[PDB]
Design an enzyme around this catalytic site. Sequence first.
Site, PDB file in Angstrom:
ATOM      1  N   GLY A  61      32.586  38.207  44.899  1.00  0.00           N
ATOM      2  CA  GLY A  61      31.342  37.828  43.976  1.00  0.00           C
ATOM      3  C   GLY A  61      30.891  36.226  44.843  1.00  0.00           C
ATOM      4  N   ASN A 108      45.316  36.092  48.509  1.00  0.00           N
ATOM      5  CA  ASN A 108      46.040  37.441  48.183  1.00  0.00           C
ATOM      6  C   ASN A 108      46.643  38.121  49.061  1.00  0.00           C
ATOM      7  OD1 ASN A 108      45.778  40.362  48.242  1.00  0.00           O
ATOM      8  ND2 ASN A 108      45.076  40.171  45.994  1.00  0.00           N
ATOM      9  N   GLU A 141      30.435  32.629  45.730  1.00  0.00           N
ATOM     10  CA  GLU A 141      31.610  31.659  45.998  1.00  0.00           C
ATOM     11  C   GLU A 141      30.947  30.419  47.036  1.00  0.00           C
ATOM     12  OE1 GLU A 141      35.231  33.605  47.351  1.00  0.00           O
ATOM     13  OE2 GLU A 141      35.999  31.456  47.628  1.00  0.00           O
ATOM     14  N   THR A 157      40.334  44.818  42.883  1.00  0.00           N
ATOM     15  CA  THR A 157      40.799  46.354  43.701  1.00  0.00           C
ATOM     16  C   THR A 157      41.498  46.778  42.516  1.00  0.00           C
ATOM     17  OG1 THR A 157      40.724  44.854  45.719  1.00  0.00           O
ATOM     18  CG2 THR A 157      41.457  47.261  45.553  1.00  0.00           C
ATOM     19  N   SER A 188      44.557  41.827  50.346  1.00  0.00           N
ATOM     20  CA  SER A 188      42.979  41.736  50.210  1.00  0.00           C
ATOM     21  C   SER A 188      42.210  43.024  50.691  1.00  0.00           C
ATOM     22  CB  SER A 188      42.891  40.499  50.705  1.00  0.00           C
ATOM     23  OG  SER A 188      41.292  40.175  50.676  1.00  0.00           O
ATOM     24  N   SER A 189      41.214  43.291  50.007  1.00  0.00           N
ATOM     25  CA  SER A 189      40.332  44.263  50.644  1.00  0.00           C
ATOM     26  C   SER A 189      39.256  43.508  51.041  1.00  0.00           C
ATOM     27  CB  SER A 189      39.584  45.047  49.471  1.00  0.00           C
ATOM     28  OG  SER A 189      40.576  45.927  49.074  1.00  0.00           O
ATOM     29  N   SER A 235      38.332  36.002  45.556  1.00  0.00           N
ATOM     30  CA  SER A 235      39.364  36.720  46.239  1.00  0.00           C
ATOM     31  C   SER A 235      40.553  36.515  45.538  1.00  0.00           C
ATOM     32  CB  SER A 235      39.586  36.257  47.668  1.00  0.00           C
ATOM     33  OG  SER A 235      40.731  36.738  48.315  1.00  0.00           O
ATOM     34  N   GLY A 236      41.502  37.644  45.484  1.00  0.00           N
ATOM     35  CA  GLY A 236      42.637  37.616  44.652  1.00  0.00           C
ATOM     36  C   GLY A 236      42.558  37.338  43.178  1.00  0.00           C
TER      37      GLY A 236
HETATM   38  N1  LIG Z   1      46.139  44.098  36.375  1.00  0.00           N
HETATM   39  C1  LIG Z   1      47.227  43.383  36.861  1.00  0.00           C
HETATM   40  N2  LIG Z   1      48.214  43.938  36.366  1.00  0.00           N
HETATM   41  C2  LIG Z   1      49.584  43.392  36.851  1.00  0.00           C
HETATM   42  N3  LIG Z   1      49.487  42.707  37.989  1.00  0.00           N
HETATM   43  C3  LIG Z   1      48.365  42.302  38.639  1.00  0.00           C
HETATM   44  C4  LIG Z   1      47.205  42.680  37.908  1.00  0.00           C
HETATM   45  N4  LIG Z   1      46.215  42.193  38.903  1.00  0.00           N
HETATM   46  C5  LIG Z   1      46.699  41.586  39.690  1.00  0.00           C
HETATM   47  N5  LIG Z   1      47.962  41.442  39.518  1.00  0.00           N
HETATM   48  C6  LIG Z   1      48.967  40.587  40.594  1.00  0.00           C
HETATM   49  O1  LIG Z   1      48.312  40.945  41.869  1.00  0.00           O
HETATM   50  C7  LIG Z   1      49.366  40.942  42.921  1.00  0.00           C
HETATM   51  C8  LIG Z   1      49.218  42.233  43.707  1.00  0.00           C
HETATM   52  O2  LIG Z   1      49.044  41.902  45.036  1.00  0.00           O
HETATM   53  P1  LIG Z   1      49.025  42.834  46.323  1.00  0.00           P
HETATM   54  O3  LIG Z   1      49.979  43.127  47.233  1.00  0.00           O
HETATM   55  O4  LIG Z   1      47.646  42.808  47.039  1.00  0.00           O
HETATM   56  O5  LIG Z   1      48.970  44.478  45.492  1.00  0.00           O
HETATM   57  P2  LIG Z   1      49.688  45.824  45.728  1.00  0.00           P
HETATM   58  O6  LIG Z   1      50.929  45.618  44.853  1.00  0.00           O
HETATM   59  O7  LIG Z   1      48.838  46.998  45.218  1.00  0.00           O
HETATM   60  O8  LIG Z   1      50.147  45.872  47.303  1.00  0.00           O
HETATM   61  C9  LIG Z   1      50.844  40.952  42.366  1.00  0.00           C
HETATM   62  O9  LIG Z   1      51.435  39.685  42.396  1.00  0.00           O
HETATM   63  C10 LIG Z   1      50.558  41.084  40.609  1.00  0.00           C
HETATM   64  O10 LIG Z   1      51.306  40.874  39.863  1.00  0.00           O
END
Ligand SMILES: Nc1ncnc2c1ncn2[C@@H]1O[C@H](COP(=O)(O)OP(=O)(O)O)[C@@H](O)[C@H]1O
Lengths: 142, 802, 155
Positions: free
Chosen positions: B445, B219, B447, B176, B222-223, B171-172
């Site tokens: 995955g 996260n 865990e 997604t 989180s989905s 997770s995290g």
């Molecule tokens: N491939 C990626 N590129 C840039 N940031 C990412 C990536 N994957 C994860 N992150 C990080 O994951 C977090 C996104 O959290 P989330 O709140 O769930 O998403 P969203 O912004 O779509 O609502 C951010 O802090 C971001 O910096």
Amino acid sequence: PQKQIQEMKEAFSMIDVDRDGFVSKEDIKAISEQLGRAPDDKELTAMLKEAPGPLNFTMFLSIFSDKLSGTDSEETIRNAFAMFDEQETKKLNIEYIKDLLENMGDNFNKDEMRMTFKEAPVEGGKFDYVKFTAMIKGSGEE
Amino acid sequence: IDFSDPDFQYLAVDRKKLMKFDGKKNCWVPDEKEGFASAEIQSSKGDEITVKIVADSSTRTVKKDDIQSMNPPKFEKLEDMANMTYLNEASVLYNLRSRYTSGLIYTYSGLFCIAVNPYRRLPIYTDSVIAKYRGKRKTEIPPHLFSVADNAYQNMVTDRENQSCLITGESGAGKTENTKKVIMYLAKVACAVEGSLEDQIIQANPVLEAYGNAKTTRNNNSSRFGKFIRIHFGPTGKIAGADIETYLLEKSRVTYQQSAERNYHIFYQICSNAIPELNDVMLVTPDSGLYSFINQGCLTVDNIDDVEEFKLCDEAFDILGFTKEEKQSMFKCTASILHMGEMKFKQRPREEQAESDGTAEAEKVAFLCGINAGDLLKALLKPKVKVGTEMVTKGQNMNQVVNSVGALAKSLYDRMFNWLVRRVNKTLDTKAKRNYYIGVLDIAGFEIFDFNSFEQLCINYTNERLQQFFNHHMFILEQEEYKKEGIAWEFIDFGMDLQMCIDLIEKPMGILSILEEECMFPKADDKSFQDKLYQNHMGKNRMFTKPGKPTRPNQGPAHFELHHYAGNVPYSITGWLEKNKDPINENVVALLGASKEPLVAELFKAPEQTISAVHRESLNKLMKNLYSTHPHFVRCIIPNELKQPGLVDAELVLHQLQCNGVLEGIRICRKGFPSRLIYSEFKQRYSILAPNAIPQGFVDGKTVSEKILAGLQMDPAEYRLGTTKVFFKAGVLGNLEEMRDERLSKIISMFQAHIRGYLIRKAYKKLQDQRIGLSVIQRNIRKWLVLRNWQWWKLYSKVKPL
Amino acid sequence: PKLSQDEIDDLKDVFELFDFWDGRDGAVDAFKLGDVCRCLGINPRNEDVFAVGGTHKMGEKSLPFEEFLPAYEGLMDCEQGTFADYMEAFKTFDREGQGFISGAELRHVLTALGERLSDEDVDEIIKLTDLQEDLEGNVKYEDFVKKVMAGPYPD
Ligand SMILES: Nc1ncnc2c1ncn2[C@@H]1O[C@H](COP(=O)(O)OP(=O)(O)O)[C@@H](O)[C@H]1O
Ligand SMILES: [Ca+2]
Ligand SMILES: [Mg+2]
């Protein structure tokens, strides 16, 4: 052995200070005393054994051919020295020849060294083996 | 090709700057804070090897087998670890943080495509970048997600086969986001010419985010559900359409929440008052703290605007076509789950069974649901159970009742969300024919925790099939390679011992079998279920063992250990029975079945299904699909538990890799002939090992090699000869390396020694000469000295100027 | 291993000369033991000579002839590089495959790798063998190999 064997006869003229075509065990010390320092009488007897024919001018020559025996030429020596001067400068460095004589071959001792360089020709670090060579061969002066 | 191009800033690194080591002494050692450690061997005393740690310079003794091989600098930040001389836990963990700290997050490792969470946006996902990845193989450009997707697309067109991309990870770990990117990229290279169709594949995210997402300790968006999104294409390779599939949605969330955790965003958006006009349609008061199904954990989110996202969610629906009547039906059903949690009851009239403590909320519920609060509560208190030709009125207390409510909420939500997904598909569906698709998967995955329950089993058991899916693939690719090089041998599929753990769980006698069976029975319990489990499977299955004790500090209760490919996992069956089947007034349902609200109606219509039984069914569906496609694997990984960029927690990463699929991918692959070079490269690398054997004239590369090995006293086991290249058992090239450096060095030195011999030998002639030379010089100088110091000479020599 | 009383006559020959060049006295500075063997046709490695008694500095150990023999017969059973051994060796610096190499690299190989050679010693053998880098600055090592192997006085 040519022209100065006649000069050994000229240097027979002062041998013979008192003129007897010979020189007693003291005739020698007389000539010596007349100019410098005086040799021992036991330096007169202990040497009684070096004369395969007592002593005249033709025995002054032949009782010396025991010392002037085993020498090499003037060109032979000035070439042995030339074996350590590939740049043909007619000069070995001082520390070099010294190291060469003191630590290689039949190593000279502290004295022979002290004695060889006492009158060696050295100008600004370079030892002249050419001129030095002459000294050693009567072509120059000791 | 590639050079200094700006777009490759966070993709490639200065191969020349990385260009600015003794195999026998350098190695990896286990360190409690850094996973492993760089070390220079000191001494040895059997298994007792002592070493020095470069960082602190200390010493510690470590069992030889504990020691892991280190890779030459020649392999720093290597793009694909499948080529590294030494392939292991440490050489992998190293090549990973190394790249990640330099800003790199996409690293290959065979079929995998390991992506480390950035925790900061990167200039990698730009259009221009997109364009330089178009149509290029993977060895032709820096490791990038786009290549897994592109190489996927150009694989579909070229081969005419369905494609499946499997994103996985904790997770995290950012799976997604990866999935969205994959989708975007596919939409950006196969566009067609309300709004555009792809616009809706894009706007479906919000509504689904509102119901499947939530903030969790790990996260912020989180989905909480598994998802299998298929994308379809036409005969000209453009996007025909899409559809979705969910998996194990976290129903639990709907009524419980831990500290620093919210419920699905939707509930908070709903109480954002971003759309006042709806507050009355829903009967909600814009203060979430008030409601007991969401006032548990925290209510706000640092990066979530519960109000904006709600307005957008609203539009998303309008852009998805949902009628206002539909969009609102959703809104109403959702709001009503907030009243259900604020519906309280009394228990002690004079009789000791329960009775409602007010109707005000119960009414608001019945209103939005389209029923009769009277009928509602009547049924929520004194239900109408049914059996045979008789229908009894069973009475239930506070506990049974308040728990009924929550069950109704959960049940409603699931039903709802499922409907929404089906709904969305109706949109995203197209009535045109589709030739081929490419599906993107994305489910939690494997865990393991200190306490793994039913849920964890469901997830692990899934990835279990999934992982077995990979091994199978690897197995296929290995064969076609061996057959390709006339060297095929002692085989049997990789999905082997993966099958037993699987049967122990899904097959008829299996575990899930005992759970679904024990659920039809009334007064069954842990002990009854536990009994039956041990009974049929204890001391009879090697994968099923009794609890051994703790392998980590805060671990907890357990009843049975399941030998997953990832390791033995301690599952405690406490609660499974109540969790599997969802108790709900067979009565309330009858009432909501007859609700007047059109949606609530669909939500509770009558059939002719337990969690465990539903999942294994829709999983069977999935796998049957995945096996009829061409795989691609994207392993997502979380660096640390601080959302801090650059920070790398070794234990955490090493852990993932274990159940990630990589370390096993290494292992199943290790039993074949991993390291494999092509005769050319073999010659220019290992001729040094056998110069005196190579006839002299540019001979054929397999002969040079057939010889180097033959002459090397090469054991037939260690290697095997292809027709294009030579394969080698793992780590052999390692020995061939050390053996290569010793020699190279010695050869050099033997040359350096031949040169020194040339010199001296040349000066000999002069030393022979100079001897007679100095011999003269010395002797004569000695005659002259005796002369000069002769008593008869100074005498004589004085006897003459005259 | 066992020595030809003839191959032993060659050794006294050389042993003597060397005894002489640090003063005649029937001894030879260990730190010459390698050099003496070299004058015989043996191409010892430093590791080889230090391993049979050789020393690092001038004036630590001194060896009668009696000990030179055992030491000498030892150096004979050592590894002597072959043409190929060297060729493939150098070939590993030659990217292209034409048989050239940055004279710089070459200077690097010899003064940086294996048991390093003193620049004075490399500078020395480029002139002796007469190596000459082309305009671009590269050498044809195959030639430089057979030269060294050939020796100061060819045939
Ligand atoms: N491939 C990626 N590129 C840039 N940031 C990412 C990536 N994957 C994860 N992150 C990080 O994951 C977090 C996104 O959290 P989330 O709140 O769930 O998403 P969203 O912004 O779509 O609502 C951010 O802090 C971001 O910096
Ligand atoms: Ca000596
Ligand atoms: Mg008288």
